[PDB]
Enzyme design. Structure first.
Site, PDB file in Angstrom:
ATOM      1  N   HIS A 181       0.808  -1.242   0.000  1.00 46.88           N
ATOM      2  CA  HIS A 181       0.000   0.000   0.000  1.00 46.88           C
ATOM      3  C   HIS A 181       0.826   1.269   0.000  1.00 46.88           C
ATOM      4  O   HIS A 181       0.884   1.986   0.986  1.00 46.88           O
ATOM      5  CB  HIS A 181      -0.957  -0.049   1.211  1.00 46.88           C
ATOM      6  CG  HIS A 181      -2.046  -1.067   1.041  1.00 46.88           C
ATOM      7  ND1 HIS A 181      -2.048  -2.274   1.698  1.00 46.88           N
ATOM      8  CD2 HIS A 181      -3.128  -1.081   0.232  1.00 46.88           C
ATOM      9  CE1 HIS A 181      -3.110  -2.973   1.335  1.00 46.88           C
ATOM     10  NE2 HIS A 181      -3.764  -2.284   0.416  1.00 46.88           N
ATOM     11  N   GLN A 206      -3.704 -17.030  -3.951  1.00 46.46           N
ATOM     12  CA  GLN A 206      -4.067 -16.297  -5.161  1.00 46.46           C
ATOM     13  C   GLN A 206      -5.219 -16.923  -5.940  1.00 46.46           C
ATOM     14  O   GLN A 206      -6.101 -16.195  -6.424  1.00 46.46           O
ATOM     15  CB  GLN A 206      -2.883 -16.035  -6.068  1.00 46.46           C
ATOM     16  CG  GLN A 206      -1.881 -15.064  -5.506  1.00 46.46           C
ATOM     17  CD  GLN A 206      -2.511 -13.698  -5.194  1.00 46.46           C
ATOM     18  OE1 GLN A 206      -3.205 -13.113  -6.033  1.00 46.46           O
ATOM     19  NE2 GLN A 206      -2.252 -13.186  -3.983  1.00 46.46           N
ATOM     20  N   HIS A 254       1.264   1.469  -5.691  1.00 45.71           N
ATOM     21  CA  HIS A 254      -0.096   0.992  -5.751  1.00 45.71           C
ATOM     22  C   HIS A 254      -1.083   2.158  -6.063  1.00 45.71           C
ATOM     23  O   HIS A 254      -1.908   2.078  -6.977  1.00 45.71           O
ATOM     24  CB  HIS A 254      -0.446   0.282  -4.434  1.00 45.71           C
ATOM     25  CG  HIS A 254      -1.900  -0.036  -4.318  1.00 45.71           C
ATOM     26  ND1 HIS A 254      -2.537  -0.929  -5.168  1.00 45.71           N
ATOM     27  CD2 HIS A 254      -2.867   0.476  -3.499  1.00 45.71           C
ATOM     28  CE1 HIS A 254      -3.814  -1.018  -4.814  1.00 45.71           C
ATOM     29  NE2 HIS A 254      -4.027  -0.168  -3.820  1.00 45.71           N
ATOM     30  N   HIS A 293      -6.806   7.190  -2.422  1.00 45.10           N
ATOM     31  CA  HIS A 293      -7.596   6.148  -1.762  1.00 45.10           C
ATOM     32  C   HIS A 293      -6.867   5.328  -0.718  1.00 45.10           C
ATOM     33  O   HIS A 293      -7.520   4.618   0.087  1.00 45.10           O
ATOM     34  CB  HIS A 293      -8.296   5.229  -2.777  1.00 45.10           C
ATOM     35  CG  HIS A 293      -7.452   4.070  -3.169  1.00 45.10           C
ATOM     36  ND1 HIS A 293      -6.343   4.224  -3.969  1.00 45.10           N
ATOM     37  CD2 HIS A 293      -7.468   2.773  -2.782  1.00 45.10           C
ATOM     38  CE1 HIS A 293      -5.737   3.059  -4.108  1.00 45.10           C
ATOM     39  NE2 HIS A 293      -6.390   2.159  -3.392  1.00 45.10           N
ATOM     40  N   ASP A 300      -8.768  -1.109  -7.981  1.00 45.69           N
ATOM     41  CA  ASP A 300      -8.100  -1.528  -6.749  1.00 45.69           C
ATOM     42  C   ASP A 300      -7.811  -3.032  -6.780  1.00 45.69           C
ATOM     43  O   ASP A 300      -6.793  -3.470  -6.232  1.00 45.69           O
ATOM     44  CB  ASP A 300      -9.055  -1.248  -5.567  1.00 45.69           C
ATOM     45  CG  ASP A 300      -8.353  -1.088  -4.235  1.00 45.69           C
ATOM     46  OD1 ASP A 300      -7.133  -0.847  -4.184  1.00 45.69           O
ATOM     47  OD2 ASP A 300      -9.051  -1.153  -3.189  1.00 45.69           O
TER      48      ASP A 300
HETATM   49  C1  LIG Z   1      -2.628 -12.307   0.740  1.00 51.60           C
HETATM   50  C2  LIG Z   1      -2.922 -13.178  -0.471  1.00 51.60           C
HETATM   51  C3  LIG Z   1      -4.393 -13.170  -0.895  1.00 51.60           C
HETATM   52  C4  LIG Z   1      -4.914 -11.803  -1.300  1.00 51.60           C
HETATM   53  O1  LIG Z   1      -4.081 -11.186  -2.273  1.00 51.60           O
HETATM   54  C5  LIG Z   1      -4.248  -9.871  -2.641  1.00 51.60           C
HETATM   55  C6  LIG Z   1      -5.172  -9.037  -2.006  1.00 51.60           C
HETATM   56  C7  LIG Z   1      -5.311  -7.705  -2.403  1.00 51.60           C
HETATM   57  C8  LIG Z   1      -6.368  -6.887  -1.688  1.00 51.60           C
HETATM   58  C9  LIG Z   1      -5.720  -5.960  -0.713  1.00 51.60           C
HETATM   59  C10 LIG Z   1      -5.345  -6.724   0.553  1.00 51.60           C
HETATM   60  N1  LIG Z   1      -5.995  -5.934   1.589  1.00 51.60           N
HETATM   61  C11 LIG Z   1      -6.820  -5.026   1.044  1.00 51.60           C
HETATM   62  O2  LIG Z   1      -7.573  -4.295   1.671  1.00 51.60           O
HETATM   63  N2  LIG Z   1      -6.712  -5.000  -0.279  1.00 51.60           N
HETATM   64  C12 LIG Z   1      -4.539  -7.159  -3.454  1.00 51.60           C
HETATM   65  C13 LIG Z   1      -3.579  -7.954  -4.115  1.00 51.60           C
HETATM   66  C14 LIG Z   1      -3.424  -9.307  -3.733  1.00 51.60           C
HETATM   67  O3  LIG Z   1      -2.554 -10.150  -4.360  1.00 51.60           O
HETATM   68  C15 LIG Z   1      -1.904  -9.715  -5.568  1.00 51.60           C
HETATM   69 MG   LIG Z   2      -7.422   0.670   0.732  1.00 49.95          MG
HETATM   70 ZN   LIG Z   3      -5.942   0.078  -2.523  1.00 47.76          ZN
END
Ligand SMILES: CCCCOc1cc(C[C@@H]2CNC(=O)N2)ccc1OC
Ligand SMILES: [Mg+2]
Ligand SMILES: [Zn+2]
Ligand SMILES: CCCCOc1cc(C[C@@H]2CNC(=O)N2)ccc1OC
Ligand SMILES: [Mg+2]
Ligand SMILES: [Zn+2]
Lengths: 329, 329
Positions: free
Chosen positions: A77, A286, A81, A117, A235
């Site tokens: 974050h 994933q 990003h 954001h 996002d």
């Molecule tokens: C942790 C592995 C499973 C989740 O993976 C992801 C999860 C997110 C969402 C993020 C995590 N928190 C949030 O509030 N938004 C983005 C990219 C990810 O992987 C490429």
């Molecule tokens: Mg956020």
């Molecule tokens: Zn975000």
């Protein structure tokens, strides 16, 4: 003065309208200012400085402070990003199904919302801030804690010396923008995702299109709902990007998650799901992430803008097939 | 040491279980500490100090700081209004239809919520704080601005020296209480009133009672909803009190409204409805207030706890008849 062949940053920035922009390369070549140069390029490209009489030095000064308030010690974050969400919203705004649908103010709001954001994100989730009785969770009554904070920081920074990029909006423009931006960012709260998606499916059921495929969006409610979902899709767009971008996003979210898990560990707390470096299944997570969240969302989006998002949806099933099929890292 | 006949404060405090408690007289006789003595009396009466092992000097010290954070220069939203909401919730908790229904923790939450529900109110509405771009509206993204602030102040004050009245709740007790208190206070937001009432009517349609008239409330959702509406009714209980209490509440809300109208005036803003001292219909406003808000709410409440609230509902129509019939002041 350099040659076209030498100015590698300007060269990369020509890809700003493409899904799959090399945003990490832009980060490196801009001297770790991807949010600033990508936002500036997008504002020029959309002619937003002219339309809202934003003075360029005001835009740059605001962009620099905003980018300064993303944490460079946070793996996921951070400013990169933010730049990726900004650039991804910028591309979604230009899908054919949405041709000429949004006013300039609504476009400003969506891109500005994407830009702020995640500002000042500390690299730990809402739930961790609630569980540790943090000052933000106390401030915000355990509810959308970080998203409330992102909004308040992004607006407040506008008051710094020469940072008011909205100084020449009319009072009524500023009031509509603010309303829209708040509605968009609050909707990035993942605890809102199931209802956001359920309500997006409902509006797709009764959507209306012109004969040439352009969506008709007659009122604030329908307009704001598309923009909330657009930014939300932006996002949650990592798994829909070329595999080599996707994998880098995955290494960064895991690194951030592991660091939270470590804080939990040294504080003697239970380790949250997917935050334990000693007990992780990166690839399976994933696949779950895609099957449970990302694909259901992008399939509904693709429905809304049919057939515009088909390639995005193909890439997503490909990346899912890849994480499913690999030998664990 | 005084005689029973001399201790006029203790004498008034014997009325704590009655609708129509002389709360202004308690304010005067307690040396302007109605919230403190009324809360202490209610905690002793309900045996809450014993049940939650609250040390009496901790309760008093917290009560004093909380009462110190209501503004004595605000005509309506001050410590006396807080004491009245606390005392009114206390009476509603004891209606026969609700006999033995709520746990002690839920009772604590409702009374604690009533006690903090308006803390640090500045005497101006959410809408005025939004329109003047205040720091609170910026902080809270224009949404439930004061109610978010009341919660954050009431919880934060618990951390002052010897103010933690919840120090002996288990972690899980403290977590449920917090959740309940947040849900109750956020529901005091008047912009939430129409939906709160619409949803209360719906739950009354399918309510279940024991044969002797006690409500059955099996889950968190139903329980919290009754408590939200209870405190909301307590907040909007002025027109259901004996006329001579009612009239004093009316003079205080008008005085507060007029002061907001004056700030608006000197700031060169449009004067909000009912805030213009030079263009007021005090009596007609009360009739509108009763016809549009207070009576629709109390009629649904009386339905929920039938026949318990009948006298409250009779007093309300009487007071409405009085404000309708009087010669203007
Ligand atoms: C942790 C592995 C499973 C989740 O993976 C992801 C999860 C997110 C969402 C993020 C995590 N928190 C949030 O509030 N938004 C983005 C990219 C990810 O992987 C490429
Ligand atoms: Mg956020
Ligand atoms: Zn975000
Ligand atoms: C102004 C006259 C019409 C309204 O009267 C009243 C309104 C209230 C509600 C207050 C006002 N603001 C709030 O958020 N809660 C309470 C007592 C009143 O009169 C006795
Ligand atoms: Mg209030
Ligand atoms: Zn109140």
């Amino acid at each position: 003065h350099m040659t076209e062949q030498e100015d590698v940053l300007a060269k990369e920035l020509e890809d700003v309208n493409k899904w799959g922009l090399h945003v990490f390369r832009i980060a490196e070549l801009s001297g770790n200012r991807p949010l600033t140069v990508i936002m500036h390029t997008i504002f020029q490209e959309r002619d937003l400085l002219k339309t809202f009489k934003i003075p360029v030095d005001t835009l740059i000064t605001y962009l620099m402070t905003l980018e300064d308030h993303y944490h460079a010690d946070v793996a996921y974050h951070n400013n990169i990003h933010a730049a990726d969400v900004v650039q991804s919203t910028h591309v979604l705004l230009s899908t054919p199904a949405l041709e000429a649908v949004f006013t300039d103010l609504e476009i400003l709001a969506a891109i500005f919302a994407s830009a702020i954001h995640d500002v000042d994100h500390p690299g730990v989730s809402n739930q961790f801030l609630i569980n540790t009785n943090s000052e933000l969770a106390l401030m915000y009554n355990d509810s959308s804690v970080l998203e409330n904070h992102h909004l308040a920081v992004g607006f407040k920074l506008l008051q710094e010396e020469n940072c008011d990029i909205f100084q020449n909006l009319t009072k009524k423009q500023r009031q509509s923008l603010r309303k829209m931006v708040i509605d968009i960012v609050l909707a990035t709260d993942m605890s809102k995702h199931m209802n956001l998606l359920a309500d997006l499916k409902t509006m797709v059921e009764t959507k209306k299109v012109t004969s040439s495929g352009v969506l008709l969006l007659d009122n604030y409610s329908d307009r704001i709902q598309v923009l909330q979902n657009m930014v939300h899709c932006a996002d949650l767009s990592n798994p829909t990007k070329p595999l080599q971008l996707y994998r880098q996003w995955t290494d960064r979210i895991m690194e951030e998650f592991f660091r939270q898990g470590d804080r939990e560990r040294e504080r003697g707390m239970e380790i949250s799901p997917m935050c334990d470096k000693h007990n992780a299944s990166v690839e399976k997570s994933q696949v779950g992430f895609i099957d449970y969240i990302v694909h259901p969302l992008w399939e509904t989006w693709a429905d809304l803008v049919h057939p515009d998002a088909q390639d995005i949806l193909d890439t997503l099933e490909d990346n899912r097939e890849w994480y499913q099929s690999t030998i664990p890292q």
